[PDB]
Design a protein around this motif. Structure first.
Motif, PDB file in Angstrom:
ATOM      1  N   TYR A 198       7.338   8.839  -1.827  1.00 31.53           N
ATOM      2  CA  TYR A 198       5.906   8.687  -1.920  1.00 31.53           C
ATOM      3  C   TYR A 198       5.140   9.901  -2.441  1.00 31.53           C
ATOM      4  O   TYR A 198       4.204   9.715  -3.257  1.00 31.53           O
ATOM      5  N   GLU A 199       5.540  11.114  -2.038  1.00 31.70           N
ATOM      6  CA  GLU A 199       4.979  12.295  -2.715  1.00 31.70           C
ATOM      7  C   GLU A 199       5.182  12.263  -4.227  1.00 31.70           C
ATOM      8  O   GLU A 199       4.304  12.561  -4.995  1.00 31.70           O
ATOM      9  N   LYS A 211      -6.196  10.480  -3.705  1.00 33.91           N
ATOM     10  CA  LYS A 211      -4.821   9.926  -3.636  1.00 33.91           C
ATOM     11  C   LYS A 211      -4.731   8.837  -2.576  1.00 33.91           C
ATOM     12  O   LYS A 211      -5.266   8.978  -1.519  1.00 33.91           O
ATOM     13  N   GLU A 251       4.461   9.606 -12.370  1.00 34.50           N
ATOM     14  CA  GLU A 251       5.254  10.001 -11.257  1.00 34.50           C
ATOM     15  C   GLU A 251       6.285  11.099 -11.577  1.00 34.50           C
ATOM     16  O   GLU A 251       6.701  11.269 -12.745  1.00 34.50           O
ATOM     17  N   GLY A 265      -0.553   5.504  -7.117  1.00 32.59           N
ATOM     18  CA  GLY A 265      -0.594   6.951  -7.226  1.00 32.59           C
ATOM     19  C   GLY A 265      -1.142   7.406  -8.551  1.00 32.59           C
ATOM     20  O   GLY A 265      -2.009   8.317  -8.623  1.00 32.59           O
ATOM     21  N   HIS A 266      -0.721   6.750  -9.666  1.00 34.52           N
ATOM     22  CA  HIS A 266      -1.204   7.047 -10.994  1.00 34.52           C
ATOM     23  C   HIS A 266      -2.711   6.832 -11.107  1.00 34.52           C
ATOM     24  O   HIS A 266      -3.450   7.621 -11.713  1.00 34.52           O
ATOM     25  N   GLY A 270       2.752  10.234  -6.127  1.00 34.89           N
ATOM     26  CA  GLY A 270       1.389  10.675  -6.163  1.00 34.89           C
ATOM     27  C   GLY A 270       0.565  10.364  -4.915  1.00 34.89           C
ATOM     28  O   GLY A 270      -0.676  10.408  -4.971  1.00 34.89           O
ATOM     29  N   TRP A 271       1.258  10.068  -3.856  1.00 35.71           N
ATOM     30  CA  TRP A 271       0.615   9.744  -2.566  1.00 35.71           C
ATOM     31  C   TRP A 271       0.493  11.014  -1.723  1.00 35.71           C
ATOM     32  O   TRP A 271       1.376  11.875  -1.726  1.00 35.71           O
ATOM     33  N   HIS A 272      -0.535  10.979  -0.881  1.00 38.59           N
ATOM     34  CA  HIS A 272      -0.668  11.893   0.271  1.00 38.59           C
ATOM     35  C   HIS A 272       0.137  11.308   1.442  1.00 38.59           C
ATOM     36  O   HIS A 272       0.002  10.114   1.731  1.00 38.59           O
ATOM     37  N   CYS A 293       3.274   1.087  -5.881  1.00 36.26           N
ATOM     38  CA  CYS A 293       2.882   2.381  -5.297  1.00 36.26           C
ATOM     39  C   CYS A 293       2.928   3.438  -6.360  1.00 36.26           C
ATOM     40  O   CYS A 293       2.087   4.389  -6.322  1.00 36.26           O
ATOM     41  N   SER A 294       3.803   3.302  -7.354  1.00 32.46           N
ATOM     42  CA  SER A 294       3.711   4.176  -8.550  1.00 32.46           C
ATOM     43  C   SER A 294       2.394   4.057  -9.267  1.00 32.46           C
ATOM     44  O   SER A 294       1.758   5.018  -9.582  1.00 32.46           O
TER      45      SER A 294
END
Lengths: 670, 669
Positions: free
Chosen positions: A210-211, A243, B204, A176-177, A214-216, A172-173
């Motif tokens: 999660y924010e 995102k 991040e 987001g990246h 880089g997630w919505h 998930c990192s």
């Protein structure tokens, strides 16, 4: 199209199909499917684009159940919507022998299941890979003046177990990246799995993490009855293009059960007869065991015509694209067919003994650059530093937000996710051939994803440098010892350890040909010679003879070697020959392929009546007895290594020509 | 006191000791030691409590370098402050054969290095476990009216690589959840920290993620020259008592190098002669190779006197505690000595064949409950599994914030961090004997931590249920196949697969005895009988004979089995005997211990002239040729499993009494 009461009825049909299946099997996990049924309704009836009569429709949305223990959820949806792999008879054989409804979802069993899940966290990472594949192909092929030929979403349902596993944070990192705006994760926030509630180990702010990645994030406070909000949440996820989105959907585990909703007991055991009665009553459900009302089928089975039209519309788009862009279409078709191009294998170079020896990590770089122009689907990268790995494809740039057509992936120090993301890339079933790379020792970080490649028949190529004590000074934290044995023992995983240039070409040839089975290739830091009679074709045989003192005369002793140690065997043979012994040298690049040869071939290499046998490999002797027997001897290393220069380590640990000769003499006494 | 100028000199001495060492070895990682030198100055000269002449001082602060490639940083500090394990001559033997300065830090080599690091992410997890140990012992033993006898901080330096590894998110989630206020992590935020990769792979918001995990976060924007701010950050971290603290320290990798600072090149290759002379120039450093100025030693070697004082003061606190709490002191001393209590082994129960059979996962529950009262240092738990598993100690409750004295740990679904945390608990060297548990299949998530147990000589007990296709319906995602082989191959890890109650006791007896080597115990879901002649002592021999048809007579065929399959060998023996064969049955609970026996013992069990041999085990044939030879046969499963009830799986895969009988007849030729 549909009333709120008929949605509710549809939601409850999903619930009771799961419940009744798990009662019949007397095994399984009803609580998650009961909580997630509203999401299933929305996803399958209103949001997802798919053809239930064609699970291979190229441009379908992909669904992954990362929370694989909830498999009766997915099988309930697939049955309801008309997939031919999950008729009612298969619902009634959940968890039974040779059913198409195994306890965890398995792509290799059930058409319409995309990947294999169950081991927590793998699914969300596979979903990241499926989204990478979509983004990559869309960037490479879509044209601005015609309808898109690649355009689909990746949906994943995951739970608290998936969120606790580190692999999910890794993947998930990266998602987001990379700004993967067509990945949409639905988090079943139900406060549980197997040790009570989650206030016992798991109080982190998952939305805030999660924010940070880089997630919505979107919050659905009532995933039990707010169908309108679930629809709204999914639309808002689609409108955020740049995102990935996490929809945190609060549900009650086992929703419907008067007595066991919101309990640990409903996680991983059938409701049983009493509670099932009470749940039918509590949810006002008069239908009997496995009985879905006809009006519910007429809703879900609307997916058949809807999917046939979606697919027909995509064909329309493709006809129009082909009209304007015939050359690009021809390339898209050839790639996404998954057929390997004519003559790709001839891209691989050949080596002569006169060619000065290189490390097999260098040969591997040669192979990657030889193949990338021949294989339009080759995509991959490293968890490392491709300076200390040599795995970049010179013909392409770096895959990133705004350059998704590029083919080199930089995973960072995320071995485990890298593997699982590669699984997703392969299992997109669009002809992408993923390779990934780190130090061989760090296969221990990514072992479950690697096993999932083998179980799920995903042809990931694992390109693993620094295979032994040959790496030297970094010391025993970094030096593999048990690793070759560990992968030889793993079902359905090729473990190839090439000696020299030809065998490295040979290793890659096997890896590419194996689209449905992963290949790990162990590569050296140190240089080695190109040994006479080593070949491409020999790798395919797994073990092959590279020297006999006297043609047609049975060996006195058989010396077998691999990789960097094959040269110890050839040198030892010269010594033993000068004493009058007849020596056979066998290169053993891949045990798995040798076991796939005929009995006759295996006997032609390793004659049963010649028990004077030595193996040499800078790794444990564990497993070698399969070939060396009780009377044979191994020259290797069964302990951890040490921190020193490589030449010192080879001497101190006795991995030398002289020890091969001594061992050969010892085995001749037995 | 010390001037800003004298501090700078001291910081540079760290930098050049590391640089010169790496130039001589022609191998290593100078950038991080150059960037972290200020942190080292503060931590070793001002903050940390330790005795450089006694690395075993119980109440020392613990330091862990998670970013283990920066090993010359720690060795430089240890040398400067007076540790007798790192004299100058060992600095000059970095990465050489049999030095005390291996490429990555190794607790088993160098006194004063607490754990083994290098594999990224392991160190921060091990630091969590060291903090758990301290919190636990403090809660069990400190009394409110006398000075504490347990009171120390756990410091960890970690970098971008550790932050990217999933294991660290797992362990830092636990540390936040547990409120470990004496854990202080210094994050070397040197972007270009490689890999990955600068603003490639890792963008991040680390500080935000750490807040999410329940940490306090402090930002030190200038870790190159702000010694006052580093001092202040550490004080603030100590003042936050109820959360672990992440100090995010912005540094320039390779600080001091005019041409290679802030580059990937300086991460993992020596500066070399040219750039070293340039750096000497740029940092106004006239001193020669490995030459630490005497005035810098007089600063750093003040740790000797300060350390002796700290340890004397702790002894004073212990004398005063003992005066008032002589019973509690006696318990503390006996535990922290690491000596196992006399007669602990008597705690294990005995079984006979008429005792109804149970699953070895149930036997293991019995053993945990038998041992917990006898072993005050037994501590452990499970990765979201104690109902399916059965691994709770009934005499204690749950370790949590506010109840650190409790002995059951709930790790959640975090297998990898569980193992590394357990390494830290063991390697606190205070007597705690950690066990951890999950389904055997999920060893694959935690394999590097397990390997670190073996390398680091940490006596972690890995309690692993659901060992085979005997688990049934969950299917091949959950069913081990290759796992026994994979651990048999692992150096210095015992892989025990007990058959019945006696062997389960014997597996635990071996595991607890082994305080310097880990033990993995594979346990069945399904019941099995107590077979005649199975024993506690037999497990210690690794393989032993449990049946011969006739006393004195050489077997015609030897059947070997493990765990749930030993009964198939004993039943098959009876069938073959009734036909007229002489049969030997051998139980093979621990291959590693068998190989430690004498040649005469091995020959007594497996006579070399008897080549008719069959092994049986619900796992791969891989490895078994070591004992069955080329002419022998295995009854097992080399494929992945399947989703069906376990009895069905055993029959379909051919793991049956009748297949053992047929295999034996084939080997007889």
């Amino acid at each position: 199209s549909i009333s709120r009461d008929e949605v509710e009825k549809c939601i409850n049909a999903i619930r009771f199909l799961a419940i009744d299946a798990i009662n019949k099997s007397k095994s399984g996990h009803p609580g998650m499917p009961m909580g997630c049924a509203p999401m299933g309704y929305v996803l399958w009836n209103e949001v997802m684009k798919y053809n239930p009569k064609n699970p291979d429709f190229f441009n379908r949305d992909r669904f992954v159940l990362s929370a694989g223990h909830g498999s009766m959820f997915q099988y309930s949806m697939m049955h309801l919507t008309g997939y031919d792999s999950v008729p009612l008879d298969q619902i009634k054989q959940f968890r039974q022998w040779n059913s198409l409804t195994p306890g965890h979802p398995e792509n290799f069993v059930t058409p319409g299941v995309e990947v294999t899940t169950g081991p927590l966290g793998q699914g969300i990472c596979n979903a990241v890979g499926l989204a990478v594949a979509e983004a990559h192909l869309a960037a490479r092929f879509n044209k601005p003046d015609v309808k898109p030929i690649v355009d689909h979403y990746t949906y994943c349902i995951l739970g608290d177990g998936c969120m606790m596993e580190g692999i999910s944070n890794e993947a998930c990192s990266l998602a987001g990246h990379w700004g993967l705006g067509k990945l949409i994760a639905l988090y079943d926030d139900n406060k549980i799995s197997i040790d009570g509630h989650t206030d016992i180990s798991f109080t982190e702010d998952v939305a805030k993490r999660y924010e940070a990645l880089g997630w919505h994030v979107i919050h659905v406070i009532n995933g039990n009855t707010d169908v309108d909000g679930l629809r709204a949440a999914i639309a808002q996820a689609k409108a955020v293009k740049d995102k990935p989105t996490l929809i945190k959907v609060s549900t009650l585990i086992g929703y419907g059960s008067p007595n066991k909703a919101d309990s640990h007991d409903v996680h991983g055991a059938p409701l049983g007869p009493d509670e099932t009665a009470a749940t039918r009553k509590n949810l006002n459900w008069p239908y009997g065991e496995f009985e879905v009302p006809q009006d519910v089928y007429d809703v879900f089975r609307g997916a058949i015509k809807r999917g046939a039209e979606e697919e027909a519309n995509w064909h329309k788009a493709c006809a129009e694209y082909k009209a304007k862009y015939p050359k690009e279409w021809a390339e898209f078709e050839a790639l996404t067919s998954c057929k390997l191009p004519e003559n790709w294998e001839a891209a691989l170079p050949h080596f002569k003994p006169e060619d000065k020896g290189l490390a097999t990590r260098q040969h591997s770089q040669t192979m990657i650059n030889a193949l990338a122009p021949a294989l339009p689907g080759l995509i991959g990268g490293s968890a490392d530093l491709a300076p200390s790995n040599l795995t970049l494809m010179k013909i392409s740039g770096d895959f990133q937000k705004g350059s998704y057509a590029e083919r080199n992936l930089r995973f960072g120090v995320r071995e485990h996710a890298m593997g699982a993301i590669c699984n997703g890339i392969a299992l997109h079933k669009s002809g992408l051939i993923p390779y990934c790379a780190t130090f061989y020792i760090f296969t221990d970080y990514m072992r479950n994803a690697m096993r999932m490649s083998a179980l799920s028949e995903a042809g990931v190529v694992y390109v693993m440098t620094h295979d032994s004590i040959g790496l030297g000074e970094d010391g025993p934290t970094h030096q593999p010892i048990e690793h070759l044995a560990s992968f030889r023992a793993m079902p359905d995983m090729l473990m190839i350890r090439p000696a020299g240039g030809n065998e490295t070409a040979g290793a890659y040839k096997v890896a590419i040909a194996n689209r449905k089975r992963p290949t790990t290739i162990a590569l050296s830091r140190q240089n080695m010679p190109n040994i006479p009679n080593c070949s491409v074709e020999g790798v395919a045989k797994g073990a092959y003879t590279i020297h006999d003192t006297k043609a047609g005369v049975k060996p006195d002793v058989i010396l077998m070697g691999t990789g960097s140690e094959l040269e110890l065997a050839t040198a030892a043979a010269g010594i033993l020959e000068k004493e009058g012994k007849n020596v056979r040298v066998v290169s053993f690049p891949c045990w798995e392929l040798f076991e796939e040869q005929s009995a006759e071939y295996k006997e032609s290499v390793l004659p049963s009546d010649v028990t004077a046998r030595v193996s040499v490999e800078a790794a444990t002797s564990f497993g070698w007895a399969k070939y060396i027997g009780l009377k044979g001897k191994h020259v290797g290393i069964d302990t951890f290594g040490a921190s020193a220069p490589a030449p010192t380590l080879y001497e101190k640990f006795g991995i030398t020509v002289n020890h091969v000769v001594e061992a050969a003499k010892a085995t001749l006494q037995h």
